[PDB]
Amino acid sequence: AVEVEVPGLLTDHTVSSIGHDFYRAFSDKWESDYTGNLTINERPSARAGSWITITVNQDVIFQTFLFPLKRDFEKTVVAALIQTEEALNRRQINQALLSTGDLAHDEF
Template sequence: MRWLLLLAWLSLVEAQAQEAEISGLVINHTITRTGNDFYRKFSERINDAGDLKANLVIKERPSARWGILIWVELENSTVYREFLSPNATSQDETAYRAADGVLNEISRRQVESLFADHIDMDKDEL
């Protein structure tokens, strides 16, 4: 009888551990001051919008010729990408516009997942 209770308890703990996923993180993988400023303003806008149901990663690649390529990844796919000039004065507007676009993409994906058919395959297998 004790083994049965122990197995039931272990299966309950395992089910709760699988459901406990951290979400709402915006991870900074920028290396320049312009990228860091973009990250800060982007994060402000995302946090002002409310609870984020996904994790985002902001990355950048500086280039002497083109400026700074900055992109935002959601579930290992790029949802926003743009070249930024290091001396541009409208970085705040660009970050806010990017955040709004990413929030729209997150909402679109959530609605799309409600109508997706996952009977034969798991979500990761698609």
């Protein structure tokens, strides 16, 4: 490896009783092979909870719905970590993993 967590721009652009905690819960388990230039946005919608939308620099790559009465929040946080890199895995990480250390965990 010989690498350090130097880059990053995770901002608490979140204003919901669940979406404010998604910021902290995501960043507590966040890890990445790319430059890590991502931020977390939410839209509060009292019909159901919050929309969560993660953006890399200025571009959306993953988004999902959070619910405050349900217990999926932890699972939805952990799943957003994988789904954030799965957007970038065919954009740019594809050349890095092909050049040295192809995948062997979950192809399809």
